[PDB]
Amino acid sequence: QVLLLPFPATNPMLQFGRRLAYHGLRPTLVTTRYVLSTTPPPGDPFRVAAISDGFDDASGMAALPDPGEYLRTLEAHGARTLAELLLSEARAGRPARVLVYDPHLPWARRVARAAGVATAAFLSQPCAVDLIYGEVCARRLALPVTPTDARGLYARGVLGVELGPDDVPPFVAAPELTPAFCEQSIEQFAGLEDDDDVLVNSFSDLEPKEAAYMESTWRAKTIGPSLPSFYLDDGRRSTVPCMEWLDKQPPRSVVLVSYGTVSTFDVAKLEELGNGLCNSGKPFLWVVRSNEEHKLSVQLRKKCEKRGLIVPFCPQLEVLAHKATGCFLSHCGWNSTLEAIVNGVPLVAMPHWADQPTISKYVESLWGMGVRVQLDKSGILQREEVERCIREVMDGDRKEDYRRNATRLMKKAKESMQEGGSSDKNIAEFAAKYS
Numbered sequence: 001q002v003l004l005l006p007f008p009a010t011n012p013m014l015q016f017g018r019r020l021a022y023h024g025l026r027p028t029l030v031t032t033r034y035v036l037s038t039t040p041p042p043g044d045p046f047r048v049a050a051i052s053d054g055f056d057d058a059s060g061m062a063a064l065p066d067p068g069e070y071l072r073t074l075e076a077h078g079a080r081t082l083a084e085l086l087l088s089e090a091r092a093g094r095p096a097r098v099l100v101y102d103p104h105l106p107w108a109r110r111v112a113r114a115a116g117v118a119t120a121a122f123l124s125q126p127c128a129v130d131l132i133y134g135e136v137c138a139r140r141l142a143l144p145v146t147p148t149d150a151r152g153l154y155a156r157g158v159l160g161v162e163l164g165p166d167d168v169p170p171f172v173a174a175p176e177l178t179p180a181f182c183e184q185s186i187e188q189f190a191g192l193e194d195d196d197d198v199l200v201n202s203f204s205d206l207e208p209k210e211a212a213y214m215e216s217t218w219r220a221k222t223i224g225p226s227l228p229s230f231y232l233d234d235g236r237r238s239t240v241p242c243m244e245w246l247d248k249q250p251p252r253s254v255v256l257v258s259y260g261t262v263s264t265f266d267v268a269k270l271e272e273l274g275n276g277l278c279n280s281g282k283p284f285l286w287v288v289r290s291n292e293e294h295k296l297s298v299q300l301r302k303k304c305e306k307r308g309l310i311v312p313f314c315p316q317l318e319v320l321a322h323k324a325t326g327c328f329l330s331h332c333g334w335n336s337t338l339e340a341i342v343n344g345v346p347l348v349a350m351p352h353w354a355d356q357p358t359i360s361k362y363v364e365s366l367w368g369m370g371v372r373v374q375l376d377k378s379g380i381l382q383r384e385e386v387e388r389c390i391r392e393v394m395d396g397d398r399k400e401d402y403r404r405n406a407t408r409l410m411k412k413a414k415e416s417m418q419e420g421g422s423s424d425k426n427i428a429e430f431a432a433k434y435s
């Protein structure tokens with residue numbers, strides 16, 4: 001079997017597993033006992049299997065909100081139970097042919113290699129960010145990484161844009177705001193040189209210098225965007241109520257709003273975001289997660305409820321593919337960004353941390369498919385700014401420029417994953433290797 005081990009939370013690794021199954025491989029999703037008991041399995045063509053993070057009954061992340069402590073606990077129990085799993089699978093007649101793993105779990109590679117199982121690292125961040133972390137891991141850049149260092153990489157043809165202070169990945173530019181995440185970002189690459197394969201959820205045409213560098217440096221092969229085949233127009237509709245609302249809207253009219261599944265916004269930040277949205281005048285679909293809703297006042301919720309819909313969950317790819325969708329106000333997490341690209345949807349970028357500031361810079365300055373919100377002197381996003389950016393992308397002099405670039409990259413993204421495409425060829429090479 002092909003074992004797939006994402007960070008326990010994913011869809012891009014599952015999408016790659018669907019393609020492996022197309023090619024006659026047998027994928028298994030590996031997740032925590034907790035997650036397996038408290039969510040539906042993926043279904044065919046996948047098996048599922050479980051490891052433990054120490055909290056099979058309760059959410060260990062809830063239980064352990066300090067990141068270092070959670071990660072140390074996940075390693076302890078995860079490495080032991082992943083070892084047990086590799087043995088029990090072999091004994092059950094289903095020995096792992098390869099472990100595909102998120103290298104935010106670097107212990108997974110140690111365990112597999114000790115069990116004699118091939119390993120395939122699966123990076124789901126852009127090549128531009130991954131390569132920066134790698135240069136630190138390899139002791140070619142010291143901490144903190146600076147704009148000066150980034151400029152060197154741009155001048156050497158490794159990075160395709162010059163990253164300023166607000167564009168360098170904060171986990172290495174300002175390490176220690178986030179010590180555990182700094183360590184985790186860099187340790188992805190520690191030992192990656194002994195993996196059998198290295199894979200990245202991107203496409204060459206998007207990040208050509210960075211992909212090329214990742215390939216020559218780390219053997220990384222692009223396999224993305226790792227999304228459902230339907231969205232990539234590769235021939236080899238839901239009933240969710242938000243969709244019915246979207247159906248009634250005019251073409252390219254609606255702002256989708258999401259800051260993702262992980263970041264938390266305080267009451268002040270939700271106030272500026274929600275007021276900016278109302279103040280724009282645009283219809284909007286604002287996904288505010290169940291676990292964040294308590295911070296949204298009645299007043300702000302009802303403020304413009306004749307134009308805007310607030311929901312706890314929307315099928316985002318289906319939303320992005322909808323004719324009524326005009327732009328996406330997004331934190332520009334990588335999955336969000338690729339889903340916007342594959343649907344040709346212009347972006348208003350409101351990054352927080354991790355890969356988002358870098359992504360945002362590429363969005364506005366190389367890809368040209370949107371704009372990034374400008375924070376004021378104290379680093380606060382103002383409602384006037386939120387509104388200005390929405391209006392810039394939906395009504396500016398440059399509105400067709402953002403749409404054109406989004407469309408352009410949509411087509412390249414599709415070409416990459418279709419038969420003959422740069423990503424398709426890498427996926428096929430992997431499937432053959434492990435067949």
Ligand SMILES: O=c1ccn([C@@H]2O[C@H](COP(=O)(O)OP(=O)(O)O)[C@@H](O)[C@H]2O)c(=O)[nH]1
Nearest residue numbers: 260261262287313314315316333334335336
């Ligand atoms: O209401 C939602 C919110 C999120 N997603 C999906 O969950 C992921 C969000 O990931 P991203 O890398 O952009 O940032 P994160 O959530 O990890 O910060 C993407 O696949 C989204 O399509 C969705 O379908 N509906």
